[PDB]
Every structure is written in C-alpha cells, then in structure tokens.
Amino acid sequence: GMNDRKILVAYFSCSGVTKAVAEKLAAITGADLYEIKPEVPYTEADLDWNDKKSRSSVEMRDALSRPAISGTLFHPEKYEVLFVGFPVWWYIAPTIINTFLESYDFAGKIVVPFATSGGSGIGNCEKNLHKAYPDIVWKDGKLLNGQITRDLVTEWFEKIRL
Ligand SMILES: Cc1cc2nc3c(=O)[nH]c(=O)nc-3n(C[C@H](O)[C@H](O)[C@H](O)COP(=O)(O)O)c2cc1C
Ligand code: NA
C-alpha cells in the first residue's frame, strides 16, 4: 500500500486546480511533490482556448511541441511510484507532460496519471500516453475533479495493486 512505497507526485498546473489535487494526494499518501515548472510561464492570454493563435492552441495542435521545463530531478530512480498530474488540454495531456516523460528514462517505472478538467474524462489522455510510451509500467489513472478522501486513495492503490 501507500506506506509500502517511496512515492513522488509530479504535476503541471496553471490555474492551481491540479496543484491543489496534487497537494492533497501527497498529504494522504505521504509522497514527495514535484512541480513541473515551464521555463516560460503560461499567461492568461497563452491559455485562451477561444483564440486559435494562443500559445496553448498552437502547441496543442503540434504533436511534436515540447515546452521546456525549468530544473531536473537528481535521483528520480529513488521513487518506486510516480503519479503524474495535469489539466486536460484539448482532450489529452499538455505537451509539457511529454517533455517531462522524455527527460528521464522511465522504461520499467510505475507511473500513475491523474488529471483535472472542465468536464472531459482522463481516458483519452491515458490511451494516448499508453501508445506514446509503451515501455512505462502504466497503472490505471483517475480524473480527480471531485472530493478526494483517504478511502478513495486507498481503494485506488488496491485496484492498481500497489
Ligand atoms: C488550453 C486549455 C485547454 C483545455 N482543454 C480542456 C478539455 O479538452 N476538456 C476539459 O474538460 N477541460 C479543458 N480545459 C480546462 C482545464 O482542464 C481545467 O480548467 C483544469 O482544472 C485546469 O487545471 P489547472 O488549474 O491545474 O491549470 C482546458 C484548459 C486550457 C487552459
Ligand atoms: Na506499458
């Protein structure tokens, strides 16, 4: 279970919703936290999904976009379980999550996705990640827009056999 693991909760958050979820997961599980920080922070304008020319619109229609991240984990291999959280952007993971997954060799490493959203599910995000990084030990993830309890998290660990 959660006590049986060295855990890192890594997350990307622009408006703080996913950050608050990450902090709660960490509090419950006793995990360490890592903020995936962009080298160039996203502004309000950048995040305007109604503007086809906004940074986020342009990045998200480019399958090869890789926003740069500020900083590096020194000993990521010391963590046995990595949770990776993000807002849903255009039905998938933001491409900074691709930058993150490609910054380390996560082959053979247990990764559990989580997300927040304005209504869309995490399933489409997961299927795309599963195909993009087949050598990661992906465990079933969760959309976490609701109430996160210690029972929800302990069941989750049970369901994914951690
Ligand atoms: C560029 C952009 C695209 C988004 N795309 C979706 C989407 O496809 N489906 C959805 O339900 N919400 C979408 N959202 C809403 C975010 O997923 C949601 O507001 C999230 O909780 C924000 O998390 P954050 O505060 O940690 O940045 C989008 C938000 C942005 C800024
Ligand atoms: Na896999």
mmCIF file of C-alpha atoms and ligand atoms in Angstrom:
data_model
loop_
_atom_site.group_PDB
_atom_site.id
_atom_site.type_symbol
_atom_site.label_atom_id
_atom_site.label_comp_id
_atom_site.label_asym_id
_atom_site.label_seq_id
_atom_site.Cartn_x
_atom_site.Cartn_y
_atom_site.Cartn_z
ATOM 1 C CA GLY A 1 0.000 0.000 0.000
ATOM 2 C CA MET A 2 0.886 3.724 0.276
ATOM 3 C CA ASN A 3 3.092 3.132 3.302
ATOM 4 C CA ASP A 4 4.827 0.332 1.340
ATOM 5 C CA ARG A 5 6.199 2.823 -1.300
ATOM 6 C CA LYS A 6 8.524 5.753 -1.925
ATOM 7 C CA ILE A 7 6.218 7.958 -3.945
ATOM 8 C CA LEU A 8 6.639 11.136 -5.999
ATOM 9 C CA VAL A 9 3.584 13.171 -7.076
ATOM 10 C CA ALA A 10 4.682 15.264 -10.052
ATOM 11 C CA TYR A 11 2.222 17.801 -11.510
ATOM 12 C CA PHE A 12 1.719 20.623 -14.022
ATOM 13 C CA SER A 13 -0.831 23.327 -13.057
ATOM 14 C CA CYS A 14 -1.548 26.769 -14.481
ATOM 15 C CA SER A 15 -4.563 27.897 -12.511
ATOM 16 C CA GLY A 16 -3.871 25.887 -9.360
ATOM 17 C CA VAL A 17 -6.656 23.332 -9.563
ATOM 18 C CA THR A 18 -4.385 20.371 -10.342
ATOM 19 C CA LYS A 19 -1.839 21.747 -7.833
ATOM 20 C CA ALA A 20 -4.425 21.592 -5.065
ATOM 21 C CA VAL A 21 -5.269 17.983 -6.024
ATOM 22 C CA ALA A 22 -1.583 17.053 -6.079
ATOM 23 C CA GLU A 23 -1.037 18.538 -2.653
ATOM 24 C CA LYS A 24 -3.976 16.575 -1.259
ATOM 25 C CA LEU A 25 -2.782 13.257 -2.792
ATOM 26 C CA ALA A 26 0.655 13.894 -1.303
ATOM 27 C CA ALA A 27 -0.789 14.730 2.101
ATOM 28 C CA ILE A 28 -2.806 11.494 2.120
ATOM 29 C CA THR A 29 -0.065 9.226 0.738
ATOM 30 C CA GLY A 30 2.964 10.888 2.387
ATOM 31 C CA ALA A 31 4.506 11.364 -1.067
ATOM 32 C CA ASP A 32 7.034 13.926 -2.092
ATOM 33 C CA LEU A 33 5.850 16.616 -4.517
ATOM 34 C CA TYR A 34 7.440 17.917 -7.727
ATOM 35 C CA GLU A 35 6.070 20.881 -9.704
ATOM 36 C CA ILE A 36 6.739 20.576 -13.434
ATOM 37 C CA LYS A 37 7.570 24.272 -13.981
ATOM 38 C CA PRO A 38 7.722 25.703 -17.509
ATOM 39 C CA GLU A 39 10.814 27.716 -18.403
ATOM 40 C CA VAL A 40 8.337 30.274 -19.799
ATOM 41 C CA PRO A 41 5.237 30.547 -17.613
ATOM 42 C CA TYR A 42 1.808 30.436 -19.265
ATOM 43 C CA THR A 43 -0.075 33.726 -19.186
ATOM 44 C CA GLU A 44 -3.843 34.265 -19.300
ATOM 45 C CA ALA A 45 -3.511 35.091 -22.997
ATOM 46 C CA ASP A 46 -1.499 31.929 -23.594
ATOM 47 C CA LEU A 47 -4.356 29.864 -22.102
ATOM 48 C CA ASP A 48 -7.194 31.371 -24.139
ATOM 49 C CA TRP A 49 -8.736 28.339 -25.748
ATOM 50 C CA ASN A 50 -11.009 30.554 -27.809
ATOM 51 C CA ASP A 51 -8.016 32.093 -29.557
ATOM 52 C CA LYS A 52 -6.724 29.780 -32.276
ATOM 53 C CA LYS A 53 -3.441 31.641 -32.217
ATOM 54 C CA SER A 54 -2.785 31.417 -28.448
ATOM 55 C CA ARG A 55 0.367 29.624 -27.310
ATOM 56 C CA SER A 56 -1.690 26.727 -25.862
ATOM 57 C CA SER A 57 -3.737 26.421 -29.115
ATOM 58 C CA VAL A 58 -0.638 26.383 -31.276
ATOM 59 C CA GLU A 59 1.279 23.957 -29.030
ATOM 60 C CA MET A 60 -1.618 21.574 -28.700
ATOM 61 C CA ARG A 61 -2.208 21.129 -32.426
ATOM 62 C CA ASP A 62 1.509 20.303 -32.803
ATOM 63 C CA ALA A 63 2.140 16.644 -31.897
ATOM 64 C CA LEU A 64 5.867 17.433 -31.627
ATOM 65 C CA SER A 65 5.634 20.509 -29.359
ATOM 66 C CA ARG A 66 7.825 20.130 -26.237
ATOM 67 C CA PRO A 67 7.584 23.090 -23.877
ATOM 68 C CA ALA A 68 10.797 23.454 -21.872
ATOM 69 C CA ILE A 69 10.918 22.730 -18.151
ATOM 70 C CA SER A 70 12.942 24.580 -15.556
ATOM 71 C CA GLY A 71 15.027 22.214 -13.352
ATOM 72 C CA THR A 72 15.837 18.483 -13.093
ATOM 73 C CA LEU A 73 15.229 15.677 -10.600
ATOM 74 C CA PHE A 74 18.612 14.495 -9.259
ATOM 75 C CA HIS A 75 17.548 10.961 -8.087
ATOM 76 C CA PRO A 76 14.156 10.132 -9.681
ATOM 77 C CA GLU A 77 15.025 6.457 -9.595
ATOM 78 C CA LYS A 78 14.760 6.540 -5.790
ATOM 79 C CA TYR A 79 10.982 6.773 -6.153
ATOM 80 C CA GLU A 80 9.211 3.462 -6.788
ATOM 81 C CA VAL A 81 5.875 5.049 -7.794
ATOM 82 C CA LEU A 82 5.379 8.240 -9.777
ATOM 83 C CA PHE A 83 1.989 9.958 -10.017
ATOM 84 C CA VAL A 84 1.877 12.430 -12.914
ATOM 85 C CA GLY A 85 -0.878 15.055 -12.891
ATOM 86 C CA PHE A 86 -2.093 17.701 -15.302
ATOM 87 C CA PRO A 87 -5.099 19.625 -16.552
ATOM 88 C CA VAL A 88 -6.793 18.097 -19.621
ATOM 89 C CA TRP A 89 -5.897 20.308 -22.591
ATOM 90 C CA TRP A 90 -7.842 19.586 -25.779
ATOM 91 C CA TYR A 91 -8.778 16.119 -24.596
ATOM 92 C CA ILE A 92 -5.179 14.994 -23.953
ATOM 93 C CA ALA A 93 -2.156 15.713 -21.764
ATOM 94 C CA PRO A 94 -0.486 19.098 -22.130
ATOM 95 C CA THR A 95 2.739 18.550 -24.163
ATOM 96 C CA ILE A 96 4.919 19.684 -21.239
ATOM 97 C CA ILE A 97 3.988 16.284 -19.784
ATOM 98 C CA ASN A 98 5.642 14.779 -22.883
ATOM 99 C CA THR A 99 8.702 16.939 -22.212
ATOM 100 C CA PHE A 100 8.746 15.591 -18.645
ATOM 101 C CA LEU A 101 8.335 11.892 -19.577
ATOM 102 C CA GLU A 102 11.084 12.264 -22.195
ATOM 103 C CA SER A 103 13.528 13.995 -19.784
ATOM 104 C CA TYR A 104 14.241 10.774 -17.853
ATOM 105 C CA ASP A 105 14.354 7.084 -18.707
ATOM 106 C CA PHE A 106 11.072 5.906 -17.296
ATOM 107 C CA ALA A 107 11.181 2.446 -19.011
ATOM 108 C CA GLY A 108 10.077 -0.122 -16.464
ATOM 109 C CA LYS A 109 8.905 2.500 -13.953
ATOM 110 C CA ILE A 110 5.446 2.543 -12.337
ATOM 111 C CA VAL A 111 3.557 5.687 -13.453
ATOM 112 C CA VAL A 112 0.006 6.622 -12.468
ATOM 113 C CA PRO A 113 -1.697 9.507 -14.290
ATOM 114 C CA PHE A 114 -4.207 11.890 -12.787
ATOM 115 C CA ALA A 115 -5.981 14.938 -14.127
ATOM 116 C CA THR A 116 -8.447 17.720 -13.550
ATOM 117 C CA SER A 117 -10.769 19.037 -16.264
ATOM 118 C CA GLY A 118 -13.720 21.255 -17.141
ATOM 119 C CA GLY A 119 -15.770 18.146 -17.807
ATOM 120 C CA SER A 120 -13.771 15.787 -20.075
ATOM 121 C CA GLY A 121 -12.517 12.430 -18.862
ATOM 122 C CA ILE A 122 -8.997 11.152 -18.394
ATOM 123 C CA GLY A 123 -9.499 8.028 -20.573
ATOM 124 C CA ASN A 124 -8.497 9.652 -23.853
ATOM 125 C CA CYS A 125 -5.431 11.128 -22.133
ATOM 126 C CA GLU A 126 -4.434 7.654 -20.857
ATOM 127 C CA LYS A 127 -4.830 5.823 -24.165
ATOM 128 C CA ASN A 128 -2.616 8.360 -25.868
ATOM 129 C CA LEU A 129 0.051 8.055 -23.156
ATOM 130 C CA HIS A 130 -0.087 4.265 -23.304
ATOM 131 C CA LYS A 131 0.714 4.335 -27.035
ATOM 132 C CA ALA A 132 3.303 7.128 -26.761
ATOM 133 C CA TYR A 133 5.378 5.390 -24.015
ATOM 134 C CA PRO A 134 4.670 1.656 -24.220
ATOM 135 C CA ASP A 135 7.664 0.762 -22.015
ATOM 136 C CA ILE A 136 6.319 2.635 -18.971
ATOM 137 C CA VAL A 137 4.522 0.456 -16.366
ATOM 138 C CA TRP A 138 1.261 2.400 -16.617
ATOM 139 C CA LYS A 139 -1.323 1.841 -13.886
ATOM 140 C CA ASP A 140 -4.948 2.954 -14.161
ATOM 141 C CA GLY A 141 -5.301 6.687 -13.560
ATOM 142 C CA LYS A 142 -8.064 8.948 -12.258
ATOM 143 C CA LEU A 143 -9.852 12.140 -13.092
ATOM 144 C CA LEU A 144 -9.884 13.962 -9.709
ATOM 145 C CA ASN A 145 -12.419 16.797 -10.063
ATOM 146 C CA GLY A 146 -14.431 15.703 -7.010
ATOM 147 C CA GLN A 147 -13.931 15.025 -3.331
ATOM 148 C CA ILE A 148 -10.651 13.194 -2.644
ATOM 149 C CA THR A 149 -10.810 11.083 0.555
ATOM 150 C CA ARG A 150 -8.346 8.715 2.194
ATOM 151 C CA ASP A 151 -10.784 5.877 1.219
ATOM 152 C CA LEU A 152 -10.699 6.894 -2.466
ATOM 153 C CA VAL A 153 -6.896 6.817 -2.489
ATOM 154 C CA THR A 154 -6.524 3.557 -0.560
ATOM 155 C CA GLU A 155 -9.001 1.831 -2.923
ATOM 156 C CA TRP A 156 -7.079 3.250 -5.857
ATOM 157 C CA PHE A 157 -3.850 1.665 -4.576
ATOM 158 C CA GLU A 158 -5.785 -1.618 -4.159
ATOM 159 C CA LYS A 159 -7.299 -1.505 -7.661
ATOM 160 C CA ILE A 160 -3.833 -0.934 -9.204
ATOM 161 C CA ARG A 161 -2.097 -3.445 -6.941
ATOM 162 C CA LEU A 162 0.251 -1.069 -5.197
HETATM 163 C C1 LIG B 1 -5.640 25.359 -23.168
HETATM 164 C C2 LIG B 1 -6.706 24.652 -22.343
HETATM 165 C C3 LIG B 1 -7.391 23.574 -22.900
HETATM 166 C C4 LIG B 1 -8.361 22.897 -22.124
HETATM 167 N N1 LIG B 1 -8.939 21.759 -22.632
HETATM 168 C C5 LIG B 1 -9.915 21.085 -21.904
HETATM 169 C C6 LIG B 1 -10.547 19.960 -22.413
HETATM 170 O O1 LIG B 1 -10.222 19.456 -23.512
HETATM 171 N N2 LIG B 1 -11.585 19.370 -21.687
HETATM 172 C C7 LIG B 1 -11.990 19.884 -20.469
HETATM 173 O O2 LIG B 1 -12.926 19.330 -19.846
HETATM 174 N N3 LIG B 1 -11.280 20.917 -19.949
HETATM 175 C C8 LIG B 1 -10.266 21.573 -20.647
HETATM 176 N N4 LIG B 1 -9.606 22.637 -20.067
HETATM 177 C C9 LIG B 1 -9.876 23.036 -18.662
HETATM 178 C C10 LIG B 1 -8.810 22.524 -17.699
HETATM 179 O O3 LIG B 1 -8.598 21.122 -17.916
HETATM 180 C C11 LIG B 1 -9.308 22.732 -16.269
HETATM 181 O O4 LIG B 1 -9.780 24.071 -16.096
HETATM 182 C C12 LIG B 1 -8.230 22.372 -15.238
HETATM 183 O O5 LIG B 1 -8.773 22.078 -13.961
HETATM 184 C C13 LIG B 1 -7.237 23.469 -15.018
HETATM 185 O O6 LIG B 1 -6.222 22.950 -14.213
HETATM 186 P P1 LIG B 1 -5.069 23.869 -13.581
HETATM 187 O O7 LIG B 1 -5.745 24.957 -12.722
HETATM 188 O O8 LIG B 1 -4.240 22.993 -12.678
HETATM 189 O O9 LIG B 1 -4.235 24.603 -14.601
HETATM 190 C C14 LIG B 1 -8.646 23.333 -20.806
HETATM 191 C C15 LIG B 1 -7.965 24.402 -20.262
HETATM 192 C C16 LIG B 1 -6.996 25.063 -21.030
HETATM 193 C C17 LIG B 1 -6.332 26.239 -20.337
HETATM 194 NA NA NA B 2 3.498 -0.212 -20.768
#
